[PDB]
Amino acid sequence: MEAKAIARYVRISPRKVRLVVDLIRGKSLEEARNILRYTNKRGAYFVAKVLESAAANAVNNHDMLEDRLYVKAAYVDEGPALKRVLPRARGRADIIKKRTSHITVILGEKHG
Amino acid sequence: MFAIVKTGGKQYRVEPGLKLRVEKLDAEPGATVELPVLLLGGEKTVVGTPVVEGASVVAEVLGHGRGKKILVSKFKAKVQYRRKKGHRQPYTELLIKEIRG
Amino acid sequence: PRAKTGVVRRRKHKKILKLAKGYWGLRSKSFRKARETLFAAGNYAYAHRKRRKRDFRRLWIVRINAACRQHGLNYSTFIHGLKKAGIEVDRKNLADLAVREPQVFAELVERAKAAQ
Amino acid sequence: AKHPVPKKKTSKARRDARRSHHALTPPTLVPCPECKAMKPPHTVCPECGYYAGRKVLEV
Amino acid sequence: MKTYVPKQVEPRWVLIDAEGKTLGRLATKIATLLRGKHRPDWTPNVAMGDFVVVVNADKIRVTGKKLEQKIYTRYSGYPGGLKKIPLEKMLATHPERVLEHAVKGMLPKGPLGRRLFKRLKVYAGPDHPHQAQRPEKLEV
Amino acid sequence: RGEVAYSGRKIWPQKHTGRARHGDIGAPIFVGGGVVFGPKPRDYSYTLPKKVRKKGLAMAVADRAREGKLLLVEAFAGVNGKTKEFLAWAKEAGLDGSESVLLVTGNELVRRAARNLPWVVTLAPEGLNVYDIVRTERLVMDLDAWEVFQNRIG
RNA sequence: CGUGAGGGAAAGGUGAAAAGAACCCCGGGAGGGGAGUGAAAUAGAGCCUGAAACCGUGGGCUUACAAGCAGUCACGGCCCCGAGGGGUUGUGGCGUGCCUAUUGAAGCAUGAGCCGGCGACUCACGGUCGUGGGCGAGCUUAAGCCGUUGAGGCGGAGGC
RNA sequence: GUGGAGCCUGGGAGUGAGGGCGCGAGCGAUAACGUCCGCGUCCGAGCGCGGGAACAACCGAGACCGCCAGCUAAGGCCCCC
RNA sequence: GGAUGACCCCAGGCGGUAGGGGAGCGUUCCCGAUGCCGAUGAAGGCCGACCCGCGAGGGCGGCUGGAGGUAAGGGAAGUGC
Ligand SMILES: CN(CC(=O)O)NC(=O)C[C@H](N)C[C@@H](O)CN
Ligand SMILES: [Mg+2]
Ligand SMILES: [Mg+2]
Ligand SMILES: [Mg+2]
Ligand SMILES: [Mg+2]
Ligand SMILES: [Mg+2]
Ligand SMILES: [Mg+2]
Ligand SMILES: [Mg+2]
Ligand SMILES: [Mg+2]
Ligand SMILES: [Mg+2]
Ligand SMILES: [Mg+2]
Ligand SMILES: [Mg+2]
Ligand SMILES: [Mg+2]
Ligand SMILES: [Mg+2]
Ligand SMILES: [Mg+2]
Ligand SMILES: [Mg+2]
Ligand SMILES: [Mg+2]
Ligand SMILES: [Mg+2]
Ligand SMILES: [Mg+2]
Ligand SMILES: [Mg+2]
Ligand SMILES: [Mg+2]
C-alpha cells in the first residue's frame, strides 16, 4: 500500500528542492521529519508539508500505520516557469526564469 | 565421423543431424542432395585430392529461406551521394543425413 | 489545395532516431546528430563486412601457422605442400582441424611434407 | 579582458559529473538526554529547553 | 560452422635463460609467447599467452657498439626533461629494464597489450621467485 | 509578400546586430509572411475540339448500346410527376434500382418524378454529356431525346 | 512600441450534459489525498488529441591503468524474451562529423545550441521541341447568344 | 576492329577559378606546394579499396549486393603486423 | 526462347560531382462517393525483435485516442527540410 502527496506549482527551482528531497528518500517517516527539521534549506519547508500531507493520507485515507511509514519514493518535476525580465546594462533585457516545482512524496509501510 | 564438404563456393564441417544453411540450392524442399567431400575424419581419416572419389554427404533440403535484412548503405561526404539498399541473402537449409565414403 | 507537412517529417525523423537507438548523447536523441552517426555507421558496416572476410582469414592463418610449427614446418611451406598435393581444404576448415582434429591436421602436414 | 565564453555546450554527462559533489549531508543530530528528542549536538534543546542537564530556556 | 573460440584455459608458465642471447632476437620470441601465437587456438582479444619468466637478464647480449651507443630516453613533461640513458648504465643499474623495454615495444598497444606485459617476469641474476607456479624451461 | 498587411520597413539594420539579415516581415521566410507560389484565382476551362466532344458523346452512347444498357421509350405511362409513379413505370421497364440510370427526356413531368431517386441522374436531352453517361450504368432515353442526340452527332 | 506620422502582436477546443467535484482529511494558503459525478477525471477547469527537444524517479547492463567524429565488424560476459532473438558492452580489428565553398577540408575555412512547426523553380500569356489523341487540303473558333445550375450547345468574325 | 564506337536531325544541360605528377620547352635563379604553354595521366568527380608510418592526384586497382571460401597486384614475410 | 511482358535461359554492363534521362514512394485536394470502412473504435499518437518492397514506403499487431476516414483507377497541386 502507498499514500501519495503532490505539491504542484511550488515556486521554488526544482534543482534546489531536489537536494532536500534526496535526503529523505528511502527514510522512515520519523527520520525524514528529523532530517527535514534541521535541514538548512528553504526547500525543507515545502518537502515537509508534502511529507506530512502524505502521512496524513496514509493514516486517514489508506489504513496505513504512522509508526510504519517510510519514504518509498520522492521526486521533483519541473512545473511551468515564471519568466521575468531582468534589466541589464546598455538597454539589454534578460529573461530570468523563476522556476516552479511539483513535489511528490510517496509513503509505503515497512512491515514489522 | 565428420566430413568437409563444398557447396556454394564455401567449405563446411558437417556431421549427421547437423542443420546447415548454405547458398541457395536449386532443389525442391524435401528432396535430398549429395555434397562433394574434401575430407573425412573421426575414425577413418581420408584426404581428398581435392575431393575423395566415392564419397558424398546426403543432405535433406529442409527448405529455402532469405537472410535477415542487411542494410547496405553508401555515403559520400560533400557530394550529396547517398544510397540505401536492403539485402536479404537467399539460402538453403540442409539437414545432414549421412556420410557415405 | 494546401499540402502542409503535417504528419510526414515527424515520421521520417522517427525512422532515423530508431536506427540510432543505443548511440551516445544527442547521437541517439537529435535527428540530425543521429543522421550523421548513421552515415558513418552505414559505411563502416560496408567496409567491415568486406574487412571481416580478411580478418577471419588472417586469424585462421595465424592458427594454422602455430599448429604447423608444432610439426616442424611453417605456414608458407605447408600451404605449398597442400598445393602440390592438390589438397584444397580452406583456411577456415584447416584452422578448425588444427584445433579440433589435431590427428587429422597431423595427417595433412605429412601429405604437405610429402608433396614437395 | 576579451569576454571568454563557453566553446561547447556542456554535455549532460559532463554537467552531471560536476554535480557529483553536490549531495547534501544530512543534519547531524543526537537525542536530547532530557526529552529524548532529536536535535543538533552542542545546542540547547529546542524541544524542552534543557542543556547540560539543567533548564536553560523557555520553549 | 563458426570459428572456434577457446573457453578459458590454464595459462602455461615458462622459463627462459637469457644469458648470451641477443636482446632483440630474444624479445621477438618472448613477445610471441606472450601473445600465445604459438598456440593453435590463438584468439586475439583474450590473454591466453604464456607467463614468461626470464633469468640472467643482466647477461643479455648486444652487437656492435650498442652498449655505449644505444640510448634509452625518458621525457618528464618538464622543460628540458629529456633524460638519456645508455645501455651500459641501464644494465649497470636496472638490467631487467633492458629486456622489459625490448619486449614491451614488440607488444600490441592497448589494454590487452598492457596486461600481456604484466605476464612478463624478468630477473637480473640466475634465480627467480616463481618456483611455485613451476615454470617449464624453454630453449630458444 | 506584397499583398500581405505588413509594412515594408527593414526590421533591423543589415549589419552588425549579430542577427540574420532581413527586410520586411511580409517576406515569405517569415511566419505570417506571404506565400511564394500559392494558388491564385484561375480558369481551368479550355476549348476541347467540338468534333472530339461530338465523337465522345457518340462513343459513350455507343458503349452503353454495345452492352445493351441503352433503352429508348415512346413515353412514360402513368408518370405525371409523382416519384411513386416513376417507380411503378421503372419496375415495368426493368429498372429496379439495381443499376444507376441516366434518364434523358424533354418531358419535365418525368424528370421531376425520377429526380429524387438516388440511382437516377436526370437530364434534358440538350444536356446529354459523356460524363453523365459514363457515371451511370444505364442510358434511358425519350424518342424525342434520341432525335436531338442524333442531330447533335449529325 | 514610437514625440509623431506610424509600427503592431500573442491569444481558439472540459463534457452528450456542469452532472464544474457536497462532505472528510493534511496544509496559513496553494496544492493534494479520499469521497462524489461522468462512458471516460493522465476529460478537473494550468481541462480534446498530447509528438519532439528538455527535466526527473525506478530498474537492467556497464564503467574509477584509460587516449576519443563516439561508430562499426568479431568474440565473450551479464540481464530479458521464449541451435532463435532483444538489451547492455568487456577485449580485439578498422575508423579524419554534417553541410557549404573549393585545385584541395576532419580540417585550425562557412553555417548550425537542440527540438517542433513555417520555409525556396510557380502561374498567365506567348514561343519552341517532344508527346497522347481529333480532324486532315484543311484544322480551328473568339467575344457573345441560348441552355444548365457542376449539361452542354450555338457562334466562322478571325487565326494557322 | 560491333563499341555506352561512329554519323545525321532535333530536345535538355552543365562547364567556360582547375590541380598534382611524367615528359617537352618558355619565363624564374639548370628557385618555389612558382608561373605559362604542349603531350599524357591521375585527382577533380575514384577524400571508395591495397601499398607508401600518417598523406587528393607516387605504386597497385576502376567499389551492383551478399559469403567466417579461393588466386593474385603493388608492397611485404624478426616483433608491433 | 513464349510468341508482343507471362516467366525462363545466355551473355555483357552497372565508382561517380555539375548535369541529362527513366521508374517509383508519400502528402493535400477532386471524381470514384446518395458508395465503402468506422464505438466490436476514424484520423492522429506511442511501440514492435513480425510481413511485403532495392528504396522512398506499405502492411500487420499491441497500447493510446475518441470520430472521423476513404479503395481499385484517374484528376489537380500552397506536395516531402
Ligand atoms: C576502455 N575501453 C572501452 C572504451 O575505451 O570505449 N577501451 C576499449 O574497449 C579499447 C578498445 N580497443 C575499443 C574498441 O573495442 C572499440 N571498437
Ligand atoms: Mg543542513
Ligand atoms: Mg499524522
Ligand atoms: Mg520551471
Ligand atoms: Mg546591472
Ligand atoms: Mg536606459
Ligand atoms: Mg535565456
Ligand atoms: Mg537560458
Ligand atoms: Mg533564464
Ligand atoms: Mg544463396
Ligand atoms: Mg552499408
Ligand atoms: Mg569524409
Ligand atoms: Mg554532400
Ligand atoms: Mg562533409
Ligand atoms: Mg570535393
Ligand atoms: Mg552526401
Ligand atoms: Mg537500393
Ligand atoms: Mg548464407
Ligand atoms: Mg512544408
Ligand atoms: Mg503541419
Ligand atoms: Mg511531421
Ligand SMILES: [Mg+2]
Ligand atoms: Mg509520428
Ligand SMILES: [Mg+2]
Ligand atoms: Mg534513439
Ligand SMILES: [Mg+2]
Ligand atoms: Mg549503447
Ligand SMILES: [Mg+2]
Ligand atoms: Mg553524441
Ligand SMILES: [Mg+2]
Ligand atoms: Mg542519449
Ligand SMILES: [Mg+2]
Ligand atoms: Mg546523457
Ligand SMILES: [Mg+2]
Ligand atoms: Mg531525449
Ligand SMILES: [Mg+2]
Ligand atoms: Mg552510409
Ligand SMILES: [Mg+2]
Ligand atoms: Mg560490404
Ligand SMILES: [Mg+2]
Ligand atoms: Mg573495407
Ligand SMILES: [Mg+2]
Ligand atoms: Mg579479399
Ligand SMILES: [Mg+2]
Ligand atoms: Mg601464428
Ligand SMILES: [Mg+2]
Ligand atoms: Mg599457390
Ligand SMILES: [Mg+2]
Ligand atoms: Mg589453399
Ligand SMILES: [Mg+2]
Ligand atoms: Mg578441443
Ligand SMILES: [Mg+2]
Ligand atoms: Mg584587461
